[PDB]
Amino acid sequence: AEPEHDQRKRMGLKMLLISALLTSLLYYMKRHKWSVLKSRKMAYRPPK
């Protein structure tokens, strides 16, 4: 029914490993860039 059965799951292994690696790395890079805004503080100082 599906001769690709063996290679399909072999790919599924490679996929899951790569995907796990890349998702983590991209999460850091996102957090790294967004760190500027995430930590940013602001004040309201008129000549009141």
For binding to ligand BOG (CB under 6 A), which residues are involved?
7, 10-11, 14-15, 18-19, 22
Q: Which tokens is 40 given?
A: 């940013």
Name the minimum Å distance from CB 1 to ligand BOG.
20
Please say whether the beta carbons of 8 and 2 come within 8 A.
yes
Q: Which is nearer to ligand BOG, 29 or 35 (CB)?
A: 29
Distance in angstroms (rounded) separating the CA atoms of residues 24 and 15: 14
Name the minimum Å distance from CB 27 to ligand BOG.
14
Q: Which is nearer to ligand BOG, 17 or 35 (CB)?
A: 17
Alpha-carbon Rg of the chain, whole angstroms?
A: 23
